[PDB]
């Protein structure tokens, strides 16, 4: 399968209540594996998956040195951006950064990305070619010229096509049992009478991995979105995911309706009926 | 593994 490593940075100013809070999270596919929180006690990059714990103490020293410095650059960024937009020093504002690398199932470089957001909206981002910039408004043009002078795009490209992919491959081997599994969904259907005459057929999908699933409802072998509720895929809390679909049907018409489940962990797409 | 490079906006 295809895989990815992704890092997420979030800095939140809090004027009058101390230094900005900085949260850093690391992800391989849908599995979070590292964490840093500027308010936490340890002040260290902490492991959040077991397979990363077999990295040595020098790895954790270096990740801690980088993430502590990155917390401060983004602290500076909050002040820089506040000036770019003529904003008072009373409001709380947010800085967000996300970068990573996708690899194909041959595990070689496929795609890279590096995005910056200020206050929940686009600020500056690298283009797919990893060579130019997309500046959102005109303030971001200031940063675009700053980063083109420092040749920043060429340096991110060097990390994404190199260190990013090669350490993603190492993580995929360090945790082959966790990261390379596919857990097919545990599916069942429930029936909940709510009315004198009408009923809800709920179609469950539990304990699957990865999170990519498709639940669609069919009536008489025909697709139907009318009268359907879909919840967004959610984590069970143990490294698996859940999702369900429900449709409202008239009583005595239940067995006109079929639920369909698509997941890469299933050799064939499942069909479920009320029985 | 994080990128070491520091970038300032």
């Amino acid at each position: 399968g295809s895989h990815s490593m992704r890092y997420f940075f979030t800095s939140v100013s809090r004027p009058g209540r101390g230094e900005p809070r900085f949260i850093a999270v690391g992800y391989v596919d849908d599995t979070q594996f590292v964490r840093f929180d500027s308010d936490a006690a340890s002040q260290r990059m902490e492991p959040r998956a077991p397979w990363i714990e077999q990295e040595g103490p020098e790895y954790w020293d270096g990740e801690t040195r980088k993430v502590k410095a990155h917390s401060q650059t983004h602290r500076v960024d909050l002040g820089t951006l506040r000036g770019y937009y003529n904003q008072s020093e009373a409001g709380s504002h947010t800085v967000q950064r996300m970068y990573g690398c996708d690899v194909g199932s041959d595990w070689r470089f496929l795609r890279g990305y590096h995005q910056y957001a200020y206050d929940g909206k686009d600020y500056i981002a690298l283009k797919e070619d990893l060579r130019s910039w997309t500046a959102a408004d005109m303030a971001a043009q200031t940063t675009k010229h700053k980063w083109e002078a420092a040749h920043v795009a060429e340096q991110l490209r060097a990390y994404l096509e190199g260190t990013c992919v090669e350490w993603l491959r190492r993580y995929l081997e360090n945790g082959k049992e966790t990261l390379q599994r596919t857990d097919a969904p545990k599916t069942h259907m429930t029936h909940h009478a709510v009315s004198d005459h009408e009923a809800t057929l709920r179609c469950w999908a539990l304990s699957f991995y990865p999170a990519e699933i498709t639940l669609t409802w069919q009536r008489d072998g025909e697709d139907q979105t009318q009268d359907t509720e879909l919840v967004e895929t959610r984590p069970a809390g143990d490294g698996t995911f859940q999702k369900w679909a429900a449709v409202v049907v008239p009583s005595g018409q239940e067995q006109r309706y079929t639920c369909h489940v698509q997941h890469e962990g299933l050799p064939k797409p499942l069909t479920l009926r009320w029985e | 593994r994080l990128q070491s490079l520091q970038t300032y906006v």
Partner: T-cell receptor, first 112, second 115 residues
Framework: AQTVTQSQPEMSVQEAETVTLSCTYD???????LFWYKQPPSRQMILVIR??????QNATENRFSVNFQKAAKSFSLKISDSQLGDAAMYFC?????????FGKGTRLSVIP | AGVIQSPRHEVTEMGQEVTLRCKPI?????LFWYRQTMMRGLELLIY????????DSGMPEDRFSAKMPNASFSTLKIQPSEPRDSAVYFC?????????????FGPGTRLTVLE
């Protein structure tokens, strides 16, 4: 996790002859910069060469060329047709978690 | 029009206070402090970007401090001075857009702490 090594602390070159100042470094990154700095007895530090590790090409500055071997983690400085003004301390440096980390330095003495 | 260091040499008796001072190149938003001995070499002490300290892991355990009150100057303060502090203390500034910006060094300040 990020170290620079200059093993020969003293070097001597005959005037107008060429001299190579060795440097090896340790890093686990693919985005980094390599630098050579020169310190005359003035003590003012000045940049000689810069090598971006992504650029494959051996950066050259007139007489000053560099033998960048990314695989071997070596970054030797070649000074051709040396002159009396080249007598100084040369420092190998690298980018990384610390923006600049310097080697121990080599004192080049130029024999007139 | 370069990094200004104040003063060139400085001779102080131990126990006194020492305040090195440095002015970056105008326009530069980042400033680095180094110290040079021939025992340990060139070591980073602390650097700032937009007057915010980004890293001070290189600063001594107990008598050293550094401020950058505004973009125009930063002070490094030893209190109290000791003979082991004798070194050349360099200041460098960069544009402050990336940690790979080339660093522009000052002439240094040679500090000698006598018994």
């Amino acid at each position: 996790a990020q170290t620079v090594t200059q093993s020969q602390p003293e070097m001597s070159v005959q005037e107008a002859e060429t001299v190579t100042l060795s440097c090896t470094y340790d890093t686990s990154e693919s985005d980094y910069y390599l630098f050579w700095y020169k310190q005359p007895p003035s003590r003012q530090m000045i940049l000689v060469i810069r090598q971006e590790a992504y650029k494959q090409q051996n950066a050259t500055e007139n007489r000053f060329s560099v033998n960048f071997q990314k695989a071997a983690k070596s970054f030797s400085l070649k000074i051709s047709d040396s002159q009396l003004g080249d007598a100084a301390m040369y420092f190998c440096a690298s980018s990384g978690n610390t923006p600049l980390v310097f080697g121990k330095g080599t004192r080049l003495s130029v024999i007139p | 029009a370069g990094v200004i260091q104040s003063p060139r040499h400085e001779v102080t008796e131990m126990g006194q206070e020492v305040t090195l001072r440095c002015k970056p190149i105008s326009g530069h938003n980042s400033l680095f402090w180094y110290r040079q001995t021939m025992m340990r070499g060139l070591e980073l002490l602390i650097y700032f970007n937009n007057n915010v300290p980004i890293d001070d892991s290189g600063m001594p355990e107990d008598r050293f401090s550094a401020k950058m009150p505004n973009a125009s100057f930063s002070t490094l303060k030893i209190q109290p001075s000791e003979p082991r502090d004798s070194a050349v203390y360099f200041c460098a500034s960069t544009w402050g857009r990336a940690s790979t910006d080339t660093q522009y060094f000052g002439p240094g300040t040679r500090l000698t702490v006598l018994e």
